[PDB]
A paper describes a structure:
The outer membrane is a formidable barrier that protects Gram-negative bacteria against environmental threats. Its integrity requires the correct folding and insertion of outer membrane proteins (OMPs) by the membrane-embedded β-barrel assembly machinery (BAM). BamA is composed of a 16-stranded β-barrel, which, in E. coli, is preceded N-terminally by five polypeptide transport associated (POTRA) domains that extend into the periplasm. The results suggest that SurA binds BAM at its soluble POTRA-1 domain, which may trigger conformational changes in both BAM and SurA that enable transfer of the unfolded OMP to the BAM lateral gate for insertion into the outer membrane.
In one, BAM is in a Lateral Wide-open conformation, in which the BamA lateral gate forms a continuous β-sheet with residues in the C-terminal region of OmpX. Remarkably, density for OmpX was again observed in the Core domain of SurA in the same location as that seen in the Arrival complex, indicating that this structure has captured BAM in the act of folding an OMP whilst SurA is still involved in binding and chaperoning its client OMP and remains bound to BamA POTRA-1. We term this the ‘Handover Complex’, reflecting a handover of the substrate from SurA to BAM for folding into the OM. Collectively these results show that an OMP can be simultaneously bound to BamA and SurA, and suggests that Extended SurA could remain bound to BAM at least during the early stages of OMP folding and insertion into the OM. It appears to be the OMP, rather than SurA, that drives the BamA lateral gate towards a Lateral Wide-open conformation, as observed in the Handover complex.
Numbering used by the authors:
A (entry chain B): 24 to 98, 105 to 392
B (entry chain E): 25 to 113
C (entry chain A): 24 to 495, 504 to 690, 699 to 808
D (entry chain D): 26 to 243
E (entry chain F): 25 to 164, 393 to 428, 431 to 441, 443 to 447, 449 to 455, 595 to 603
F (entry chain C): 30 to 109, 115 to 212
Write the structure that this text describes.
């Protein structure tokens, strides 16, 4: 009542519309992510995309027409609480859930290839490699599931401070080693054939006392290129550190990110204050920033035709020119809002609204 | 009679089980452990301990049982006197 | 070289020589070497300084001193969820207060504390800023800026890991709320840190009391969105499996009370394991031991569990300890009531073995007297001998009565004088005294009454009263009564007494009821015109019985009270009659803290004559007003007087004296029955600082009264007064407050169902019990 | 509340108000002067005047708080005996708070803790500075307080005598004999102890107190 | 004559220490090296060093760790050996250089206690998995690279801890790494019982 | 007077004197563990209403660094033309100078009247003012020779103390007026 005194300053984006991108189709998967924070996002594989909702139903879509292929419900008694981002590989589609259940469906047949029980909620996107699918549950547990049928291989244990941010980080695969984040600011590497660590390096720079509010957990997927990996804690300290061991090649204080991309000798990211920014991977020199967007609750930036596509909670899809930043266009795609990360591949992008479900956007 | 009278208790109640273990020859600490702290002690001259156990259900007999222990001026027990009381009234 | 003397600058909290005692330089004596740095360090180690600057411009120590400021005032802006009282209490507990020195470390200390408190409440986007404004004479003013952003909202409670119960059923019992119903505004979805521990223990209790013994909480996580708006709670449980009671074994240094302990531990074979059941078993064993004297036992239970047959054996270890004797009983707080009036309500005699039930029984009995706000018992061990204890009762005195003396009306309308004293505790003596006298032209009234509740030391009470009425038609009545009462048992009381009254009334109005009473008595004067007189005297014996069991004495919140009073005339008086009245007030609590109460009140009354003589009309029953169905009038419900045709009679002025015609005036029958139900709620506009003195209630009331004498002839064309089947009803809201002038009751009651000649009212104010 | 002013004339008008006896007004000026200059040259005078005004104005709890504060932060002072005597007087006055003084009711067996605290304060004063001008009145007050406490104990013993709890009577009389030997209440209460022994059939102990009261019957 | 440069929590740092480490240690036979930045530029870092030494001192005093005089004398012997300058003649060197016996004793006590506190506090929170030792051996074995790895972890963790403690320590600079000395350094009216006055309607309502 | 008066009544002066009870022959009474013990002290002290409850006067503040000093009959004050200033303030208060030695820096005044809101006690005083240096500064001494009450000389120590402190305060406040 009297306590709604939030320090909220998100200016309406400057009206600068240059070009005319449009939409292709909507699908109305149903009541999906909604107000509940999650990581559900569509995935594209060979002109076929997939989507799901918090209720449990999973829909498959053909490209270029938005026509249904097969729809199933993974409910029975109650919502399955689908949390794991939808991923696809070979002849399988993998989805997590808050009920510690991982489902693997058989793509075209739409049949449940299997499901298995893990320790704790499986928020992170299941990552597939080397015949193993990795789950980073909400306990610090990192569990490897055999690709044939379930059969947990090893469960690496990580720490858990009791105020962590939601949305645990999925790991990445490089040269037989899985690089994974943590809820205490420490990036770990694990040998993904028996469950043995290689190096666990702490990158956070937290204070104390009031730090009870400062969490500094790394929930971003670490990216790997050549001999280096990159990491971003919640409260700062962007780090680029050697693949072989936890040797910090170069660090910067800014950090404070939840999604970033690297390509073309540069790094494009968004701060925790939605300040989209570009850096040079050489030593961490700032090429440019774009501070028009503050407290706007952005999403992951995706590359598309040399343009950084981002979203917001008000639904407006923004295009940013990769050359020093300028509002190429603003699209009133939906009034529901954009919370999940957009997907871009095969020269085509998809964004699933919080309730408006998957939206296909054209240039 | 007819006016209600509450039960009245006026001292530590002692049972024959703990009485039977008292034999002349212990010190203050031993008897204090065995029976309990005496509510009534003689404040004049010699040190005498009185274990009085008196009940009164209210308009019945006032049951009484007294046990006097006479200690010497050294801390050891000398004399015992266990009276079931009821000397008339 | 050598320094001749010292000079200082600041002398606020440190005297001239106060600092000299600490500094090791010891001027006026030997002194030299860089050691002056050590002197600076020693001076600052005291903490009574903010800056120091030694200087040797001459041969004397010129010590510039900037002392730490003393705070001038404390003030703060923006606090909404936190009240000023809590902040000032914390500051008093933080070592900072007006007139006390300021240290910058406490600034960061309290900043961290306040930020942590807001993070516990849920305002994660909050920051407290402390600003110090300097003032002349080395003092500061402390301002606090609170940027309370927004409360985080809880999103879901997830009980992942359960396979035997519904998650919704499990989280229904939780104090924290997943989704507040749309049709509920009193509840919200704030996240309080203590509530998480509370409902974790609630879930643990839920599984422990349904046969699940091999149970534990694996982990709990409190996730937070990167918006500080969503709080997610996750708990991991190990379901375990159900179990059955193999048996119970009670062993240890049990006292001679082993048999009843064994009976208490008798458990039906084939029952399901309940943690609440074993806790109740332990509490019952402890209470049984404490009743017989052992106030400090030791009871423990190890449930040795075998998974092969899923059977749990309860092994109870009990150590009685030593019996405890009360050395002495002390009373605190009775600044007015003497020691005997407290000590005589005790049930735990001094110099006896401690009966832990008797202490609380005496506390209840003291609380039932009605003139003690709060009573607190404390059985504290003596610092000396092992088996001794002192029992302390702490009471807070309460104002009891009022002295009033007021002249009213006047201004050519008539002097309305009144005076009185009404005490239940006369100067703490324990007496109940009451005197009341009113003097006005129309009527004069006087009465006096004195009652000693403890005339003898058993509970016997002796009381007496005198009363006098005389006024104009004329009416005089005066009399005297003396009664005594004694207790039958812990609760019941029985009273008997006797008294005589004398009445004399003349020039009475003509109406059917009084003429009927006179014809019964044997006098049949004229009816149309009235110039008659009558005298009577009554010697009567009265009796009574009261059963009282109440939590307190002023608006109790438990138990019940019944009160029966009956008076019968003795042969030899002018009139012969008997009256029997009954009252019954019962309270039932529904809330655990005894805050919400349902009240059932009832009153019954019968009265008639003996030997063919009618009951006198000057003592009939009445209704209405307060203390009954409220909202109609004072003494108007029931039979209405009907007058015979008027004649020369008395002096009848023109434009005045406008009195068988039916009139709305009432006379009251001889059979009464009223009842009422009330719901009690706390005042929604105050806090606990006053909540012990204000009571708010919603009430429904029903009442009826009728005359048992019926005429087929006279009442042929008039309403059936003798018919009881017709009732009066009302409902409304009531507010009571223990005002500094005594108990005051306000009521608003819309007349629900009334009859002719009621003149029902809406607002009603009353003083008294 | 009073307008800001240099301390000298506000102190002068506070002193004048105290001179007239308008204590309620004078407390305001004194408190304002103390607040605005917490460590001025004559804050001790302000504290003493405030204690005097609080005591005269029947505002005892604040007077007690000020007295304790002054004792704490001025352990040594040329006139600390005045503060000690006033603390004892405050406690003793706090003991008598009722209308019963009108009727001369024997306020002896009411709550005595205030009397105990007053006795402690007066005894500390007398043992501390036996060369002061407050010592004789303190001694008289000490005698009165000791008699009052003895009377309270005798009243408790008398009630237990009436009830029938003989052991409690014996214990209470022994307590009076051990703590209040020279008072008169103990001489009054000795027959209660004798009667308790006689009723409880312990004659050999009864004739002893009989001899004690007979030799000292006077 | 002296002042205070900054105040930290309870203790205080004064101009004596900054003068002693500035006037007596800057290219003035204090390791020479013919390399020293501007006095104003190095004043900030020297003040940081002094205040951080103080902070470590109170942090250790919280645990109250004590070092006895035999350890100080052994440290003096170590200084003599590492200076190729025997203890008695080293003591004379110190005495005429400016640091007399008591100042040297206090300085060595302080440096030993702060080094001990640093070592214990850092090594309590350090971790090394027994996995990368083999990897570094193959890149380069039997604890040869383990010492180097532990040294690197110490170098990182000590700096991180220093930043963490310096950031959150109360300091007020009153004004007014470090090479140090290089050598000789070891490791109605109403009234109040109740009374009511109101307003014929004049009636007293005193309550006992 | 209403003020300067003990709030309570005089009923505490009628306490029965405490007489130690005597032990009988050949038997010992319970030991006097009674910490409630009354030390014996002489009289010569006002009791009951005759005693006065008045905040002990202390010399007030003046020029900074002026240390006040108590004496049983006199009063002293360190300071930081001080005698000409003192003479000036005495002339300003119009107190007649009976004797004056500027060379010795010692003076004697006339009778000075002190009335403080109470009847029959318009105090009159014989005061011998003087100054002498002390250490690195100067010290001012106010010496009360005589005190009179309604023409009657009195010799209670408290009155001399208070009415030396009042005169000292007159100088101190007058000294600040410069």
């Amino acid at each position: 009542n009297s306590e709604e005194d939030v320090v909220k300053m998100s200016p309406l984006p400057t009206v600068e519309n240059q070009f005319t991108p449009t939409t292709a189709w909507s699908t109305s998967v149903g009541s999906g992510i909604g107000n509940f924070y999650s990581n559900l996002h569509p995935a594209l594989a060979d002109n076929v995309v997939y989507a799901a909702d918090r209720a449990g139903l999973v829909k498959a879509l053909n490209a270029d027409d938005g026509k249904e292929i097969w729809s199933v419900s993974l409910a029975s008694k109650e919502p399955a609480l689908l949390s794991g981002g939808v991923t696809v590989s070979g002849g399988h589609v993998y989805i997590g859930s808050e009920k510690a259940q991982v489902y693997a469906l058989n793509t075209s047949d739409g049949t449940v290839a299997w499901q298995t029980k893990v320790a704790g909620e499986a928020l992170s996107r299941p990552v597939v490699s080397d015949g193993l699918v990795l789950i980073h549950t909400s306990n610090g547990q990192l569990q490897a599931l055999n690709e044939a049928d379930g059969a947990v291989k090893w469960t690496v244990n990580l720490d858990m401070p009791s105020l962590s941010l939601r949305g645990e980080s999925a790991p990445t695969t490089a040269f037989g080693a899985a690089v994974v984040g943590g809820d205490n600011g420490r990036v770990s590497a694990v040998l993904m054939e028996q469950g043995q660590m290689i190096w666990q390096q702490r990158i956070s720079q937290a204070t104390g006392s009031t730090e009870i509010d400062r969490l500094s957990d790394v929930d971003t997927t670490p990216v790997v290129v050549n001999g280096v990996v990159f990491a971003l804690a919640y409260n700062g300290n962007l780090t680029a550190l050697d693949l072989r061991s936890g040797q910090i090649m170069w660090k910067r204080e800014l950090g404070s990110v939840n999604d970033f991309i690297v390509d073309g000798n540069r790094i494009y990211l968004v701060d925790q204050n939605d300040r989209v920014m570009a850096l040079t991977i050489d030593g961490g020199v700032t090429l440019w920033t774009q501070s028009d967007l503050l407290h706007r609750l952005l999403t992951s930036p995706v590359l598309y035709n040399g343009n950084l596509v981002v979203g917001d909670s008000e639904g407006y899809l923004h295009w940013i020119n990769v050359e020093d930043g300028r509002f190429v266009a603003q699209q009133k795609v939906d009034s529901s809002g954009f919370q999940t990360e957009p997907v871009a591949a095969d020269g085509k992008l998809l964004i699933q609204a919080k309730d408006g479900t998957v939206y296909s956007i054209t240039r | 009679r007819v006016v209600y009278r509450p039960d009245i208790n006026q001292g530590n109640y002692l049972t024959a089980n703990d009485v039977s273990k008292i034999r002349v020859g212990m010190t203050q600490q031993q008897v204090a452990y065995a029976l309990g702290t005496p509510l009534m002690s003689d404040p004049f001259g010699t040190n005498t301990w009185f274990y009085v156990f008196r009940q009164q259900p209210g308009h019945e007999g006032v049951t009484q049982q007294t046990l006097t222990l006479t200690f010497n001026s050294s801390g050891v027990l000398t004399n015992i006197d266990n009276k079931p009381a009821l000397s008339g009234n | 070289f050598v320094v001749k003397d010292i000079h200082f600058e600041g002398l606020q909290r440190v005297a001239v020589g106060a600092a000299l005692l600490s500094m090791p330089v010891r001027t006026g004596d030997t002194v030299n070497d860089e050691d002056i740095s050590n002197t600076i360090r020693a001076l600052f180690a005291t903490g009574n300084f903010e800056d120091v600057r030694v200087l040797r411009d001459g041969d004397t120590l010129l010590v510039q001193v900037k002392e730490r400021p003393t705070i001038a005032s404390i003030t703060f802006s923006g606090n909404k969820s936190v009240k000023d009282d809590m902040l000032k209490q914390n500051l008093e507990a933080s070592g900072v207060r007006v007139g006390e020195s300021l240290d910058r470390t406490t600034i960061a200390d309290i900043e961290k504390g306040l930020e942590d408190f807001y993070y516990s409440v849920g305002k994660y986007s909050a920051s407290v800023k402390a600003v110090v404004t300097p003032l002349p004479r080395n003092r500061v003013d402390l301002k606090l800026v609170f940027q309370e952003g927004v409360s985080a909202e809880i999103q879901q409670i997830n009980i992942v890991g359960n396979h035997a119960f519904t998650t919704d059923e499990l989280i229904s019992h939780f104090q924290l709320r997943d989704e507040v119903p749309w049709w509920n505004v009193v509840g919200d979805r704030k996240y309080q840190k203590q509530k998480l521990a509370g409902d974790l223990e609630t879930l643990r209790s839920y599984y422990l009391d349904r046969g699940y013994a091999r149970f534990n909480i694996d982990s709990t996580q409190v996730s937070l969105t990167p918006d500080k708006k969503g709080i997610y709670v996750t708990v991991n449980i190990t379901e375990g499996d159900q179990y059955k009671l193999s048996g119970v074994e009670v062993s240890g240094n049990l006292a001679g009370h082993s048999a009843e302990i064994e009976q208490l531990t008798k458990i039906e074979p084939g029952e399901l394991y309940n943690g609440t059941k074993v806790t109740k078993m332990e509490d019952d064993i402890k209470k049984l031991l404490g009743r017989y004297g052992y106030a400090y036992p030791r009871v423990q239970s190890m449930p040795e569990i075998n998974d092969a047959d899923k059977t749990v054996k309860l092994r109870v270890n009990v150590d009685a300890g030593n019996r405890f004797y009360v050395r002495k009983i002390r009373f605190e707080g009775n600044d007015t009531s003497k020691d005997a009036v407290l000590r005589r309500e005790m049930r735990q005699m001094e110099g006896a073995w401690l009966g832990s039930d008797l202490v609380d029984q005496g506390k209840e009995r003291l609380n039932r007297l009605g003139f003690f706000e709060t009573v607190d018992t404390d059985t504290q061990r003596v610092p000396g001998s092992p088996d001794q204890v002192d029992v302390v009762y702490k009471v807070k005195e309460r104002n009891t009565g009022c002295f009033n003396f007021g002249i009213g009306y006047g201004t050519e309308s008539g002097v309305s004088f009144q005076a009185g004293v009404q005490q239940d505790n006369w100067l703490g003596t324990g007496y109940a005294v009451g005197i009341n006298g009113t003097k006005n032209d129309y009527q004069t009234y006087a009465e006096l009454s004195v009652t000693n509740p403890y005339f003898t030391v058993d509970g016997v009470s002796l009381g007496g009263r005198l009363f006098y009425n005389d006024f104009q038609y004329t009416n005089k009545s005066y009399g005297t009564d003396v009664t005594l009462g004694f207790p039958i048992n812990e609760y019941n009381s029985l009273r008997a007494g006797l008294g005589y009254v004398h009445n004399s009334l003349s020039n009475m109005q003509p109406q059917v009821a009084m003429w009927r009473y006179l014809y019964s008595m044997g006098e049949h004067p004229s009816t149309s015109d009235q110039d008659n007189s009558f005298k009577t005297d009554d010697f009567t014996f009265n009796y009574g019985w009261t059963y009282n069991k109440l939590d307190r004495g002023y608006f109790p919140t438990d138990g019940s009270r019944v009160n029966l009073t009956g008076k019968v005339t003795i042969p030899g008086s002018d009139n012969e009659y008997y009256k029997v009245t009954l009252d019954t007030a019962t309270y039932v609590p529904i809330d655990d803290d005894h805050k919400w109460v349902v009240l059932g009140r009832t009153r019954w009354g019968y009265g008639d004559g003996l030997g063919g003589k009618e009951m006198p009309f000057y003592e009939n029953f009445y209704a209405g007003g307060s203390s009954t169905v409220r909202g109609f009038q004072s003494n108007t419900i029931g039979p209405k007087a009907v007058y015979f045709p008027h004649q020369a009679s008395n002096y009848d002025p023109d434009y005045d004296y406008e009195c068988l015609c039916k009139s709305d005036d009432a006379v009251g029958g001889n059979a009464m029955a009223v009842a009422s139900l009330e719901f009690i709620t706390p005042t929604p506009f105050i806090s606990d600082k006053y909540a012990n003195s204000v009571r708010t209630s919603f009430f429904w009331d029903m009442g009826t009264v009728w005359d048992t004498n019926w005429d087929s002839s006279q009442y042929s064309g008039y309403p059936d007064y003798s018919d009881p089947s017709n009732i009066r009803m009302s409902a409304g809201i009531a507010l009571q407050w223990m005002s500094p002038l005594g108990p005051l009751v306000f009521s608003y009651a819309q007349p629900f169902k009334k009859y002719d000649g009621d003149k029902a009212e809406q607002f009603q104010f009353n003083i008294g019990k | 509340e009073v307008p800001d002013n240099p301390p000298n004339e506000i102190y002068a008008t506070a002193q004048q108000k105290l001179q007239d006896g308008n204590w309620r007004q004078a407390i305001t000026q004194l408190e304002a002067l103390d607040n605005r200059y917490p460590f001025g040259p004559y804050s001790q005078q302000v504290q003493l005047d405030l204690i005097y005004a609080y005591y005269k104005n029947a505002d005892l709890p604040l007077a007690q708080a000020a007295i304790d504060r002054f004792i704490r932060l001025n352990p040594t002072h040329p006139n600390i005996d005045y503060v000690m005597y006033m603390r004892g007087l405050t406690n003793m006055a706090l003991d008598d708070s009722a209308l019963q003084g009108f009727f001369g009711v024997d306020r002896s067996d009411r709550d005595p803790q205030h009397a105990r605290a007053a006795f402690s304060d007066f005894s500390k004063l007398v043992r501390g500075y036996p060369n002061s001008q407050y010592t004789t009145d303190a001694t008289k007050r000490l005698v009165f307080l000791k008699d009052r406490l003895a009377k309270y104990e005798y009243s408790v013993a008398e009630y237990y005598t009436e009830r029938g709890a003989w052991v409690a009577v014996v214990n209470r009389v022994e307590g009076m004999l051990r703590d209040y030997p020279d008072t008169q209440a103990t001489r009054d209460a000795l027959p209660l102890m004798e009667n308790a022994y006689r009723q409880m059939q312990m004659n050999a102990q009864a004739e002893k107190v009989a001899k004690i009261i007979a030799a000292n019957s006077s | 004559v002296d002042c205070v440069a900054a105040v930290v929590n309870n203790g205080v740092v004064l101009e004596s220490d900054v003068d002693g480490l500035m006037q007596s240690v800057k290219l003035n036979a204090a390791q020479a090296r013919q390399q020293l930045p501007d006095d104003a530029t190095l004043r900030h870092q020297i003040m940081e060093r002094l205040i951080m030494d103080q902070i470590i001192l109170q942090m250790g005093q919280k645990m109250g760790v004590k070092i006895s005089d035999e350890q100080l004398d052994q440290a003096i012997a170590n200084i003599a050996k590492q200076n190729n300058m025997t203890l008695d003649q080293m003591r004379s060197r110190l005495a005429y250089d400016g640091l007399n016996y008591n100042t040297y004793r206090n300085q060595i006590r302080k440096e030993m206690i702060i080094s001990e506190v640093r070592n214990n506090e850092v090594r309590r929170r350090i971790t090394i998995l027994p996995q990368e030792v083999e990897s570094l051996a193959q890149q380069v074995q039997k604890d040869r690279a383990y010492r180097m790895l532990m040294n690197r972890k110490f170098s990182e963790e000590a700096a991180s801890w220093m930043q963490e403690q310096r950031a959150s320590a109360y300091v007020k600079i009153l004004s007014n790494x470090x090479x140090x000395x290089x050598x000789x350094x070891x490791x109605x009216x109403x009234x109040x019982x109740x009374x009511x006055x109101x307003x014929w309607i004049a009636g007293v309502g005193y309550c006992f | 007077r209403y003020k300067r008066q003990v709030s309570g009544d005089e009923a505490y002066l009628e306490a029965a004197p405490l007489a130690e009870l005597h032990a009988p022959a050949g038997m010992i009474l319970p030991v006097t563990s009674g910490d409630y013990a009354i030390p014996v002290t002489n009289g010569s002290g006002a009791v009951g209403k005759a005693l006065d409850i008045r905040p002990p006067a202390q010399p007030l503040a003046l020029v900074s660094g002026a240390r006040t000093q108590f004496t049983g009959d006199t009063a002293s004050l360190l300071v930081e033309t001080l005698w000409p200033q003192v003479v000036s303030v005495l002339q300003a208060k119009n107190y007649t100078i009976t004797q004056r030695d500027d060379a010795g820096q010692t003076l004697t005044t006339d009778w000075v009247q002190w009335n403080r809101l109470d009847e029959d006690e318009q105090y009159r005083g014989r005061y011998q003012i003087s100054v002498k240096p002390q250490g690195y500064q100067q010290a001012v001494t106010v010496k009360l020779l005589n005190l009179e009450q309604a023409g009657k000389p009195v010799a209670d120590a408290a009155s001399m103390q208070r009415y030396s402190t009042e005169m000292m305060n007159v100088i101190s406040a007058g000294l600040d007026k410069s």
